Amino acid sequence: MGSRSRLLAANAAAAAFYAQALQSDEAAPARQYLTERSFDAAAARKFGCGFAPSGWDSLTKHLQRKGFEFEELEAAGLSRQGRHGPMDRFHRRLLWPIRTSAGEVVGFGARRLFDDDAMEAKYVNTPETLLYKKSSVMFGIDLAKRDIAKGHQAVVVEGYTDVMAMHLAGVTTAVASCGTAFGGEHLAMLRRLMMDDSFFRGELIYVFDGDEAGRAAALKAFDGEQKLAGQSFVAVAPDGMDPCDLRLKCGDAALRDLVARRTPLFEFAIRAAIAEMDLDSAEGRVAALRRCVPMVGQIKDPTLRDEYARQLAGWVGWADV
Amino acid sequence: MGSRSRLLAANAAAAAFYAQALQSDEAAPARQYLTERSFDAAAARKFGCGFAPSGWDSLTKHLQRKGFEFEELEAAGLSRQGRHGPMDRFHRRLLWPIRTSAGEVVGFGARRLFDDDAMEAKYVNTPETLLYKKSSVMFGIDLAKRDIAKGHQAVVVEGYTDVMAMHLAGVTTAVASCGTAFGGEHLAMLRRLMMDFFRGELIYVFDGDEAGRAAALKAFDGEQKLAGQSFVAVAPDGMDPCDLRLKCGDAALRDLVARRTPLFEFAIRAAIAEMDLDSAEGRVAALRRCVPMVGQIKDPTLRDEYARQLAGWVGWA
DNA sequence: ACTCCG
DNA sequence: CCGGAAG
């Protein structure tokens, strides 16, 4: 009673219930959200997509009949303390079940679909429980687990629909931060899977939406450098778009090649600084070096710093590229 | 009395005596030898180079005066009992001290300088003492210990003079298996240093000759998952790292190490080099001989990488 | 493997 | 009245 093995059965029973409810009459805008961005019902079923019904306690009552006591459901982040009996957490929202590496269901990410929705946020997730650890949790991990270790690659993307779009386009290494910013436990988790024989060898690709978001991620490459900055990479979609919207406009090939034709994390940052530079005659040419040999100076890896110093003169214009 | 700290004291005092002896009259061939390949006195002082004097027992007496019993000096591998009294191990030679990673002298490596030298062998070493362990001992480790950990790169030259050259040229990760060839306990030490950050390269540097390919047929056989992180640089023909610095310069050695071939790539393209490859009949025979090699690669992702490139290496098939 | 020159 | 290498 009220232990991991029980609570994972509740979330599994809930996943089934929410996946059942996706096919109802009132779940029309939920299915339309998916098909609007090229996600058919077979894709929705692969990622466990679901709908949260509109009533007070449509889930709580369903699980209470299946045998689950309320205190277990409260602990699993499905039901909650109400006035006239217990009530549900999620209402009138498109759901994505969030699984572990093992494929055990730990929580849900719920998207808004209605203007009269009482909940403010565009996305809301399961609260902190014994099962659901926001800071370590990642969407897509159950599917990607084997492909990231085999391939020695991981593609980090922003949202839920970005992970679906990547997986359907062949990029099965794709995962998402899921509720908050990408962080240390997420890296630690991903890094552990790519390890072989007590050595890390793979590559760590970060996809971004718009340009400044990625420039505002490359900046922080130099912040600590304890991470695998040498094995980190950046991919930015053509001016404006993100992986989901890129798939609609230009098809599954554009995603495969966005990942393929990427840039190293330090390179992207350095060249971003040269991009915003005058570079005509010697005036702005020296102003480039002035500003971004400090950037090279900050690189702690001497093998890697020597490589960027070699190429620095060429990129600004004073040497042959 | 014959303890570990006693034998360290004896060896350090011996390295001091031998270093003083290098500035003497009879040590002129040793001073020339070093300076003849661009190692000045400042370099010689950095690595602690020294001359073993000519007589029967100049060191042995010198240490006995300082306090050291003969029994300790025999355990330290410095002296040995002759019939008319104690006598030195080394005579009339250029010595390099060999140290622990901390910087403590455990033994000595000694080169022949004269045609009338007692010992005809090219290099003498200290025997298996309580400190000196041939299988784990490495010249240049004291100087590189830090830099291989920071840089995540270890460079394995052959000779004593190659370690010297590399370090003066800026390759401060260079190291050398003195006495014996490079081995298991050396790898296990260098692998350890580079862990404490995850990854780590490991570059081997041979002369421009068949020595590299023979030590290399041994690239496939064992599981050896450090073979992904192994690399092989090789200079212009005939030249060790010491000779390369004489001809070309300090920049040539840096770039030799920086322009390195991976161990599997080196092994494949070595077999490609000894093949017809001009006619279309020649390309097929090459492709036939060196897919078994790509098949011997146990790692599947690494195997497929080398298969892709194989079409290119064999003159576009 | 027991019996010439630094 | 040597120690290494000769064999």
Curated annotation (Swiss-Prot), chain B:
Amino-acid positions noted as binding Mg(2+) 1 in the UniProt annotation, renumbered to this chain: E158, D207
Keyword Zinc-finger applies: yes
UniProtKB keywords: DNA replication, DNA-binding, DNA-directed RNA polymerase, Magnesium, Metal-binding, Nucleotidyltransferase, Primosome, Transcription, Transferase, Zinc, Zinc-finger
Single Gene Ontology BP annotation: DNA replication, synthesis of primer
Gene Ontology CC: cytoplasm; DNA-directed RNA polymerase complex; plasma membrane; primosome complex
Domain of life from the UniProt record: Bacteria
Residues engaged in binding Mg(2+) 2: D207, D209
Domain Toprim positions: 152-236
GO molecular-function terms, A-Z: DNA binding; DNA-directed RNA polymerase activity; zinc ion binding
Misc remark: Was identified as a high-confidence drug target.
Family label: Belongs to the DnaG primase family.
Note on domains (UniProt): Contains an N-terminal zinc-binding domain, a central core domain that contains the primase activity, and a C-terminal DnaB-binding domain.
Subunit description: Monomer. Interacts with DnaB. Co-immunoprecipitates with DarG in the presence and absence of darT.
Function: RNA polymerase that catalyzes the synthesis of short RNA molecules used as primers for DNA polymerase during DNA replication.
Name of this chain's protein: DNA primase
Annotated source species: Mycobacterium tuberculosis (strain ATCC 25618 / H37Rv)
